[PDB]
Amino acid sequence: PIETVPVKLKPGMDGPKVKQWPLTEEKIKALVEICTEMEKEGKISKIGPENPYNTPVFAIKKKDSTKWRKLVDFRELNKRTQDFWEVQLGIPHPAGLKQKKSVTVLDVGDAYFSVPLDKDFRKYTAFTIPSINNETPGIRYQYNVLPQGWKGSPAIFQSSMTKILEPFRKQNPDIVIYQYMDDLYVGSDLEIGQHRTKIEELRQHLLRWGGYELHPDKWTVQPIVLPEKDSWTVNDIQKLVGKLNWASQIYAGIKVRQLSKLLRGTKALTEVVPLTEEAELELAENREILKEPVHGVYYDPSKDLIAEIQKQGQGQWTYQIYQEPFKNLKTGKYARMKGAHTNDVKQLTEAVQKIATESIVIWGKTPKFKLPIQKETWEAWWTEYWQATWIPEWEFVNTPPLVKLWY
Amino acid sequence: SPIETVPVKLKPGMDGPKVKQWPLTEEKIKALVEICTEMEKEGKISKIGPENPYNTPVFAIKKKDSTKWRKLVDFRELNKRTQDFWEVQLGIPHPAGLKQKKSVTVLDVGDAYFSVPLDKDFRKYTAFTIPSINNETPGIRYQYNVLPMGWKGSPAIFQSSMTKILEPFRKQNPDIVIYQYMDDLYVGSDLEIGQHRTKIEELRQHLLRWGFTTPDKKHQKEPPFLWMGYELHPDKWTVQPIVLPEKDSWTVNDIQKLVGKLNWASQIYAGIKVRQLSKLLRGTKALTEVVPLTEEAELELAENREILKEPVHGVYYDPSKDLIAEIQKQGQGQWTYQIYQEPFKNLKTGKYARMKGAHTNDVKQLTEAVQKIATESIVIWGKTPKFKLPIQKETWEAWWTEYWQATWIPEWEFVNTPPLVKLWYQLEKEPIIGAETFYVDGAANRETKLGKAGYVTDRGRQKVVPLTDTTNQKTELQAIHLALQDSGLEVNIVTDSQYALGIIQAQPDKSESELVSQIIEQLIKKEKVYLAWVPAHKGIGGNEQVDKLVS
Numbered sequence: 001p002i003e004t005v006p007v008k009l010k011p012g013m014d015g016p017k018v019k020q021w022p023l024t025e026e027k028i029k030a031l032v033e034i035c036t037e038m039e040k041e042g043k044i045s046k047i048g049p050e051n052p053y054n055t056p057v058f059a060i061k062k063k064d065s066t067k068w069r070k071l072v073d074f075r076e077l078n079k080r081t082q083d084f085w086e087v088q089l090g091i092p093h094p095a096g097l098k099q100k101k102s103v104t105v106l107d108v109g110d111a112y113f114s115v116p117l118d119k120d121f122r123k124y125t126a127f128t129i130p131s132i133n134n135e136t137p138g139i140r141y142q143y144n145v146l147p148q149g150w151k152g153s154p155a156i157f158q159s160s161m162t163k164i165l166e167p168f169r170k171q172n173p174d175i176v177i178y179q180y181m182d183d184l185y186v187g188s189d190l191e192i193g194q195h196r197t198k199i200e201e202l203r204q205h206l207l208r209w210g211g212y213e214l215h216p217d218k219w220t221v222q223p224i225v226l227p228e229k230d231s232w233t234v235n236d237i238q239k240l241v242g243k244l245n246w247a248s249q250i251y252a253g254i255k256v257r258q259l260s261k262l263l264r265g266t267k268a269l270t271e272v273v274p275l276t277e278e279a280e281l282e283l284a285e286n287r288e289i290l291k292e293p294v295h296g297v298y299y300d301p302s303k304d305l306i307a308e309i310q311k312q313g314q315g316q317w318t319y320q321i322y323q324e325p326f327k328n329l330k331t332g333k334y335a336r337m338k339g340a341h342t343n344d345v346k347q348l349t350e351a352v353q354k355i356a357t358e359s360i361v362i363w364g365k366t367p368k369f370k371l372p373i374q375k376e377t378w379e380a381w382w383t384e385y386w387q388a389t390w391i392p393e394w395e396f397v398n399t400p401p402l403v404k405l406w407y
Numbered sequence: 408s409p410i411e412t413v414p415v416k417l418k419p420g421m422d423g424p425k426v427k428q429w430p431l432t433e434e435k436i437k438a439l440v441e442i443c444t445e446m447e448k449e450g451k452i453s454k455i456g457p458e459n460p461y462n463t464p465v466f467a468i469k470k471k472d473s474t475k476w477r478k479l480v481d482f483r484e485l486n487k488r489t490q491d492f493w494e495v496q497l498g499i500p501h502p503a504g505l506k507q508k509k510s511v512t513v514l515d516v517g518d519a520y521f522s523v524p525l526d527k528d529f530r531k532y533t534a535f536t537i538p539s540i541n542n543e544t545p546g547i548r549y550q551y552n553v554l555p556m557g558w559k560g561s562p563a564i565f566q567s568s569m570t571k572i573l574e575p576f577r578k579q580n581p582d583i584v585i586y587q588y589m590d591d592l593y594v595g596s597d598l599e600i601g602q603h604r605t606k607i608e609e610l611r612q613h614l615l616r617w618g619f620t621t622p623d624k625k626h627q628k629e630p631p632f633l634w635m636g637y638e639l640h641p642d643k644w645t646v647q648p649i650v651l652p653e654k655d656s657w658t659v660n661d662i663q664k665l666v667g668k669l670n671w672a673s674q675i676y677a678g679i680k681v682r683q684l685s686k687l688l689r690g691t692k693a694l695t696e697v698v699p700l701t702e703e704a705e706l707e708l709a710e711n712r713e714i715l716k717e718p719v720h721g722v723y724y725d726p727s728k729d730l731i732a733e734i735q736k737q738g739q740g741q742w743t744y745q746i747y748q749e750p751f752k753n754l755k756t757g758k759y760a761r762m763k764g765a766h767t768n769d770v771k772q773l774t775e776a777v778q779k780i781a782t783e784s785i786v787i788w789g790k791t792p793k794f795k796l797p798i799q800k801e802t803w804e805a806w807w808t809e810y811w812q813a814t815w816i817p818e819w820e821f822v823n824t825p826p827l828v829k830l831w832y833q834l835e836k837e838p839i840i841g842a843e844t845f846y847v848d849g850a851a852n853r854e855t856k857l858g859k860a861g862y863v864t865d866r867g868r869q870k871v872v873p874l875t876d877t878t879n880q881k882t883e884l885q886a887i888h889l890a891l892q893d894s895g896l897e898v899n900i901v902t903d904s905q906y907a908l909g910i911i912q913a914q915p916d917k918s919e920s921e922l923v924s925q926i927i928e929q930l931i932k933k934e935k936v937y938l939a940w941v942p943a944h945k946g947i948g949g950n951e952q953v954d955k956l957v958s
């Protein structure tokens with residue numbers, strides 16, 4: 001006997017009408033196995049075309065657990081869904097999660113499958129399984145339960161989740177758990193083996209009612225750097241002045257008066273110009289300013305987070321997170337460690353997951369990404385490398401590198 | 408017929424259609440009456456009266472050759488008011504996706520839409536009226552009890568209904584492949600033909616319980632099978648013959664028909680090109696406008712006609728072997744590909760000829776072709792093929808190292824098939840020793856459309872060119888164009904245009920812009936170019952002098 005929570009789309013908004021994209025054989029087969037089992041257990045229901053909504057569906061395999069995980073890209077639905085700040089069912093973000101030795105992320109999505117979803121809202125959850133070579137029409141299901149990937153499922157299940165974790169959290173006051181979407185983030189200052197075990201304990205407790213290891217303490221900001229040389233060419237100084245001129249819309253009191261005058265006239269780019277002692281002083285002050293974080297930048301919870309990424313070559317990827325332009329909350333450098341080093345798209349997709357995971361840990365939500373990639377190149381391959389149960393918002397930018405400011 | 412109906416609604420706030428009946432000839436009226444009577448006897452429609460306020464026009468159209476009359480109900484008004492549907496036909500089966508089968512049958516169901524009942528509460532909306540002759544009676548009204556032809560919801564509701572009906576049979580017979588396209592069923596098996604035929608009529612019996620006939624006229628038991636516009640032989644498949652227009656005088660619409668036929672032919676006929684013929688479609692203003700074929704369009708047409716003269720076939724898919732995709736470059740942004748598993752035995756062919764973007768190069772277009780083929784391969788075979796590409800590994804390496812966007816191509820082998828895809832120039836990463844340095848700048852008057860482009864150099868040279876009917880961005884491109892024009896084989900250029908720098912850094916080899924094209928031509932002829940940026944109006948070096956000069 002369970003009662004549903006009445007849910008609405010936002011005023012003036014209809015449900016999602018997003019087309020299914022083509023799927024590989026092994027993802028189709030996995031989805032057909034998963035969905036017939038879910039249909040049997042009443043979690044979803046076979047529907048027809050009289051339901052005009054749709055959301056793409058695909059599958060992923062985590063690296064350490066090699067069973068397939070179904071993933072319905074409810075980004076569109078979540079945007080159209082009522083806020084739960086208003087039904088007072090939202091989840092606060094605990095500071096201090098970012099200050100922990102290690103954070104372990106657990107897929108807690110199944111727990112949502114024990115709570116029915118408002119009968120009048122299920123039509124918005126429809127998805128379609130494709131068929132190889134279009135042998136058959138698509139097969140359509142809608143959810144009867146809180147679906148995984150829906151922003152409303154953590155909100156509605158929130159009361160229940162708090163009860164489940166009350167013993168663990170009173171038994172373990174120093175552990176901090178934050179729930180984001182289908183994920184539970186657990187952080188502790190204990191040494192790995194012990195931390196892990198308490199993760200095992202949590203897993204067992206969770207199983208009874210019904211990971212990825214992060215070390216935030218060792219994420220480090222990578223600031224802007226100026227080159228250090230002894231001999232400088234006109235082109236070096238030009239490159240230097242243009243970089244500092246750009247950094248002056250972020251940092252305060254950066255000057256180029258002295259270095260710029262070193263360039264008076266119409267000079268060959270290869271001509272070495274010795275530094276005035278004054279320009280050496282100008283360079284010094286600027287270097288010092290670039291050294292420490294910017295003053296006056298604070299997170300605003302009412303504004304969205306935005307992330308920019310630049311490819312730097314040799315497996316390196318710079319990124320900045322901000323809410324307002326030039327008021328960066330965090331600047332960083334992502335590096336690939338696989339060893340293959342062959343695939344830009346896989347690297348970027350891993351960079352996006354890692355940057356989004358940091359934002360979840362730091363601020364409790366993911367940013368909208370500005371991705372340095374062709375839409376069509378990204379859409380050809382990214383699902384081959386996705387491993388999160390959430391998907392962030394993104395858009396595609398083609399911005400040539402004016403100055404290589406971040407490297 | 409005993410399938411449960413699918414409930415359907417009008418769009419919210421909307422009532423049914425109320426469209427007047429166009430007057431009609433008695434001959435048409437008489438044929439409509441005959442047809443309607445038969446449908447009524449069969450239960451497809453029922454007589455209604457004037458207390459139903461809805462209406463949709465009915466027209467009478469002639470048959471293919473018989474002269475028999477055909478009933479059409481123009482549901483355009485009802486369709487706009489009917490709810491949306493999520494369509495379940497996601498694509499078109501392709502014969503290159505079939506595996507070889509020992510026994511094959513192609514069958515249709517007869518009167519497919521008229522075998523599926525329509526939602527009882529929705530029936531009133533489908534009201535149509537046969538007019539009297541010159542208003543002798545108000546006329547005879549009918550509504551549909553079944554899926555009407557021409558109604559927006561009929562294809563999806565039929566498709567879904569037929570999926571539900573075939574579901575029990577598919578599950579029970581998992582080694583029987585059934586391709587279900589609307590009312591058309593392809594059935595392949597590895598059974599002996601005696602047992603295969605047994606299974607066929609078990610299937611027919613199952614469809615008959617659910618009210619789907621399978622008429623013998625539409626039952627094909629021997630190769631070649633006519634299927635989805637193709638011919639299925641046991642080892643090979645064929646497109647049904649493609650006939651191209653053969654006009655002396657061509658209109659826009661004729662050309663549109665020709666390009667279309669050629670696109671269709673390109674799934675199996677390798678090397679089809681349509682760029683020159685399609686160019687004829689640009690900037691035209693009527694479907695009836697006569698368009699003279701250019702010389703290029705005629706040569707392209709004759710090349711294609713040669714290709715079509717020869718017979719071709721595709722083969723079927725064997726899952727135990729790899730898929731291989733091979734691409735050749737044809738020129739002017741055109742690409743052609745073959746997909747195969749054994750050499751010289753094509754599953755299918757294709758072409759990629761789209762111009763994406765104002766400015767691009769062959770490496771990006773090759774990347775797009777790879778993405779197109781990769782998508783088509785997943786649609787057809789559920790996997791991505793191995794590629795053979797006419798691009799050196801050194802070329803690909805130079806591209807993705809220097810280009811700032813992420814990019815990738817899956818596993819591929821170099822194939823030596825000239826012309827090869829190459830980068831046509833590469834900007835220097837460092838300023839060139841001994842090369843003259845050019846400080847360029849262009850500026851335009853937003854209000855006047857007048858501007859100037861010019862440069863000053865470390866060797867004391869300078870020049871200003873006046874420009875008319877220009878823009879800011881063009882004067883900057885024009886400034887670089889001048890520097891390239893007046894400089895030697897090695898040159899350092901310093902611009903303040905992020906715009907112009909961004910175009911050129913991406914090493915385009917073609918552009919919809921003649922000015923950019925000229926620049927590309929110039930870049931290809933240089934030995935070394937270094938292109939650097941400075942911020943404008945900061946009084947920096949040469950930039951200040953040149954900005955001063957254009958003023």
Ligand SMILES: OC[C@H]1O[C@@](CO)(O[C@H]2O[C@H](CO)[C@@H](O)[C@H](O)[C@H]2O)[C@@H](O)[C@@H]1O
Binds near residue numbers: 019
């Ligand atoms: O990658 C863009 C591509 O993704 C689709 C899936 O079909 O949908 C997503 O696109 C955006 C990514 O942030 C979101 O705005 C959108 O809500 C999400 O569904 C396509 O719509 C889009 O072309």
